[PDB]
Design a protein around this nucleic acid. Structure first.
Ligand SMILES: O=c1ccn([C@@H]2O[C@H](COP(=O)(O)OP(=O)(O)O)[C@@H](O)[C@H]2O)c(=O)[nH]1
Ligand SMILES: [Cl-]
Ligand SMILES: [Mn+2]
Ligand SMILES: [Mn+2]
Ligand SMILES: [Mn+2]
Length: 535
RNA sequence: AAAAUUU
RNA sequence: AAUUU
């Protein structure tokens, strides 16, 4: 019945023009050679994304959906949730949040400038008084960097972002923020994935696996999830929110937001033209993450029940999930997963790639990552989290006038410190760069290069400095990703590391600690690395 | 654009 | 600031 979008035919315009790489990338031209493969999704491509996400939905539910939905409300009603003062909501606005059409921005909101505060009052008033007038939204293309993949057609089209004015964003927070803090955890218990560290994800997955007599695992992701969310789904989202204890004022605000913003509305391009109208999720509203996660969880747990998945243990994160079950034999497991997929398709959550049962934990990817294993210092197995390095390395080579990638290097160094690709490739390059700039002291994104050993120890354990015998998959994928981006192969990084190491060590102080801990993989006669006072 | 995690 | 959805 319902179309996800309709389109005036107006363009989707740039929200301030999007930069190009330059003829020389001085920071990353020793990391990799193939800069032609590293691109940023543009608003030109937004047209192409639109064609792909505009489609007719035909939700069809059943006793399994209905039953799960029920149970989910009996959970919701254990939650009491309060309004947020206009001022508290203002304060949660991010520092660079896109300015309001009504002549103020985030500095003002966050500083409680009085003009902003009045306007926000008036907006919230209008929410309370008017429960139907569609609220206008701006549509825009997201800019993100990837490596071209000629297998999957060259360049991905830009994702679509659709969001209301800043005044409305604050009001959303007033009504719903507290819910976002309580509801998901309440409804989903241990399945609520955003509650966990990568280390907890990893132990959760291993505990789930260990608990089964004979475990089977799989993952699912919905294609264009936001466009698959139905008017009805959203209303059902509302109905889940209202199940909690609420100020009568929240309810009205919520109901109003739901009907005027969340189920749909007109879309305007950055130049003010009418662009289209929308009858699905606007990714950009405060409820995007909580909505996606909850809704995905309803459908999935219904679909498990439809398909006979035995003793399922879920982990949900937006439209991304993993179920670890008791295998019923491969012949049946295959059948049930076809069933799972049919059910999810009937609920309007169709998959990108149809899923497949797996019986080895390394072969399950979700949220662009997976668990792997290597051997630690004493020879014991150590499971950790990793991913294809393609995108991180691509992003590591995104240098423009407005943007430096050094922060990305650090970000990935920390989050993925135990990975063979961070330790051999990013660390080496990162350190090599700063030593030469002579800016080890320098703080980046408020972190200090010379703290890393500590920071890494606090986060991944001391084993992250002694891991070896990485898996075939992991070696294969890293080798292959470096080849793809024209980077030196690992043998070369072994050399560069050893140089960086000696150079770091000669400098003494915290530098030599970094040299000694971070790069012990590089040397033939290892060292006796001991815990670090700080972590 | 929003949230979560990391810091 | 980083990453993810
Ligand atoms: O930068 C992002 C990426 C994803 N999402 C939301 O998370 C959903 C699932 O993300 P995925 O990575 O699976 O992309 P999609 O399924 O939309 O193609 C999207 O549809 C969005 O609604 C978002 O709000 N912002
Ligand atoms: Cl060990
Ligand atoms: Mn998806
Ligand atoms: Mn209502
Ligand atoms: Mn996804």
């Amino acid at each position: 019945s319902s179309m996800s979008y309709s389109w005036t035919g107006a363009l989707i315009t740039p929200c301030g023009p999007e930069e190009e790489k330059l003829p020389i990338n001085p920071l990353s031209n020793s990391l990799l050679r193939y800069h032609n493969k590293v691109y940023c999704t543009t608003s030109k491509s937004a047209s192409q994304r639109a064609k792909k996400v505009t489609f007719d939905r035909t939700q069809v539910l059943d006793a399994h959906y209905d039953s799960v939905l029920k149970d989910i409300k009996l959970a919701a009603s254990k939650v009491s949730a309060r309004l947020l003062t206009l001022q508290q909501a203002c304060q949660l606005t991010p520092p660079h949040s896109a300015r309001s059409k009504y002549g103020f921005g985030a500095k003002e909101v966050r500083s409680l400038s009085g003009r902003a505060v009045n306007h926000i009052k008036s907006v919230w008033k209008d929410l309370l008084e008017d429960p139907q007038t569609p609220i206008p939204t701006t549509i825009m293309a997201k800019n993100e960097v990837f490596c071209v993949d000629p297998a999957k057609g060259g360049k991905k089209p830009a994702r679509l972002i659709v969001y209301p004015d800043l005044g409305v964003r604050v009001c959303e927070k007033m009504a719903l923020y507290d819910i976002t803090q309580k509801l998901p955890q309440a409804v989903m218990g241990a399945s609520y994935g955003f509650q966990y560290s990568p280390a907890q994800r990893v132990e959760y997955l291993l505990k789930a696996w260990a608990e089964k007599k004979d475990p089977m695992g799989f993952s699912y992701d919905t294609r264009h999830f936001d466009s698959t969310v139905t008017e009805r789904d959203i209303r059902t989202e509302e109905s889940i929110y209202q199940a909690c204890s609420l100020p009568e004022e929240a309810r009205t605000a919520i109901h109003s937001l739901t009907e005027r913003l969340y189920v749909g509305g007109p879309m305007f391009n950055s130049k003010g033209q009418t662009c289209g109208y929308r009858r699905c999720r606007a990714s950009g509203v405060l409820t995007t993450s909580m909505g996606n996660t909850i809704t995905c969880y309803v459908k999935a747990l219904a679909a498990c029940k439809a398909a006979g998945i035995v003793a399922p243990t879920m982990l949900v994160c937006g439209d991304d999930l993993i179920v670890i079950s008791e295998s019923q034999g491969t012949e049946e497991d295959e059948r049930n997963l076809r069933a799972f997929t049919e059910a999810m398709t009937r609920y309007s959550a169709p998959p990108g790639d149809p899923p497949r049962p797996e019986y080895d934990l390394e072969l399950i990817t979700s949220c662009s990552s997976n668990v792997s294993v290597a051997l630690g210092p004493r020879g014991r197995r150590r499971y950790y989290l990793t991913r294809d390095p393609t995108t991180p390395l691509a992003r590591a080579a995104w240098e423009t006038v407005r943007h430096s990638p050094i922060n990305s290097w650090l970000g990935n160094i920390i989050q993925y410190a135990p990975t063979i690709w961070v330790r051999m490739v990013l660390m080496t390059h990162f350190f090599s760069i700063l030593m030469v700039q002579d800016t080890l002291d320098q703080n980046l994104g408020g972190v200090n290069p010379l703290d890393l050993p500590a920071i890494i120890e606090r986060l991944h354990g001391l084993d992250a400095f002694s891991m070896h015998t990485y898996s075939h998959h992991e070696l294969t994928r890293v080798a292959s990703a470096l080849r793809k981006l024209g980077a030196p192969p690992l043998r070369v990084w072994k050399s560069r590391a050893r140089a960086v190491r000696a150079s770091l060590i000669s400098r003494g102080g915290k530098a030599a600690v970094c040299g000694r801990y971070l790069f012990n993989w590089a040397v033939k006669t290892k060292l006796k690395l001991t815990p670090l006072p700080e972590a």
